[PDB]
UniProtKB/Swiss-Prot annotation:
Alphabetized InterPro entries for the sequence: AB_hydrolase_3, AB_hydrolase_fold, GDXG_lipolytic_enzyme, KFase_ver/fungi-typ
Upper taxonomic lineage: Eukaryota, Metazoa, Ecdysozoa, Arthropoda, Hexapoda
Protein name as it appears in the record: Kynurenine formamidase
Gene: KFase
Family to which this protein belongs: Belongs to the kynurenine formamidase family.
Keyword Cytoplasm included in the entry's annotation: no
EC number: 3.5.1.9
Any Pfam family: Abhydrolase_3
């Protein structure tokens, strides 16, 4: 429609699972690319604590699904930097058991890694899920200050890249000092402008995101009016889109990166050759992978 001027189908251009070049021997490649996603990532999660010698602390920032699993190696100092991952799933699915592919190589490079969970729609309106996420940001800074670690990196995939993007507009929580602690913000294949997808029964069935004409501003990072930009000048921001996403996905990332840059943040856009929306996460469990080396390079 808008981010894809060649568009025919929107229910296809808003489900990344259709733009994969993988599983093409299959009648429904999309179902295949999800089955695979769910399976391998759960495998990655069990392997962390059953074969990799990594330790996990089970914490929470709130009731029920509002959990933080903190992964570390005991051979490494407790004042290690902290890497925070915010998972995807269209605000309707995905959980901790599928969110920990990224942990292993980072722990092996000397990070502590916090992998968080959140409540889904429609248990919350997206709008509420977002005030809950604000509580998680307060919790994670409260927690790092406790351990007097003063270097953090945040990464969010997909709907989690969208949820993460509020860190730049919650200054009553994220002080200038807190901002100063952040080395990088990484936004993997997110959505930033919800205006289109809001009116779809395939993405938003029976309006479970609880959106409407009045809160569309609020839930669209694309549309905000950024202030107090200079306090983020120590933080590098990387908006990433995968080569084989939807065209809509890719351009949203590209424009968000532009919005960010024009407003004067240190942001860049990347189009990541060979990846789709999903294997771009799957492969974070492999230290040698392309995406791994990308995260490594952010450090210099
Ligand atoms: Na540190």
């Amino acid at each position: 429609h808008m981010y894809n001027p060649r568009c025919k189908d929107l229910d296809r251009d808003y489900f990344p699972s259709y733009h994969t070049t993988r599983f093409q021997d299959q009648p429904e490649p999309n179902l295949a690319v999800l089955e695979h996603f769910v399976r391998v990532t759960k495998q990655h999660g069990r392997e962390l604590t059953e074969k990799q010698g990594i330790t996990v602390d089970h914490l929470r920032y709130g009731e029920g699904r509002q959990l933080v699993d903190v992964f570390y190696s005991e051979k490494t100092t407790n004042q290690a930097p902290l890497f925070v991952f915010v998972h995807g799933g269209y605000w309707q699915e995905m959980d901790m058991s599928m969110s920990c592919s990224i942990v292993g190589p980072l722990v092996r490079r000397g990070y502590r890694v916090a992998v968080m969970d959140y409540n889904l729609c429609p248990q919350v309106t997206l709008e509420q899920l977002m005030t809950q996420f604000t509580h998680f940001l307060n919790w994670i800074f409260d927690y790092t200050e406790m351990t007097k670690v003063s270097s953090l990196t945040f990464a969010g995939h997909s709907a989690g890249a969208h949820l993460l993007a509020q860190i730049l507009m919650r200054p009553n929580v994220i002080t200038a000092q807190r901002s100063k602690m952040v080395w990088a913000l990484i936004f993997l294949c997110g959505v930033y402008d919800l205006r289109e997808l809001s009116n779809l029964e395939s993405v938003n069935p029976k309006n479970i995101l609880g959106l409407n004409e009045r809160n569309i501003e609020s839930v669209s990072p694309m549309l905000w009016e950024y202030t107090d930009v200079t306090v983020w000048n120590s933080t590098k921001i990387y908006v990433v889109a995968a080569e084989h996403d939807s065209t809509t996905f890719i351009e949203q990332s590209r424009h968000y990166a532009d919005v960010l840059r024009k407003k004067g943040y240190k942001a860049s856009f990347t189009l990541f050759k060979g990846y789709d929306h999903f294997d771009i996460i799957e492969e974070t469990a492999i230290d040698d992978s392309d995406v791994s080396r990308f995260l490594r390079n952010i450090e210099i």
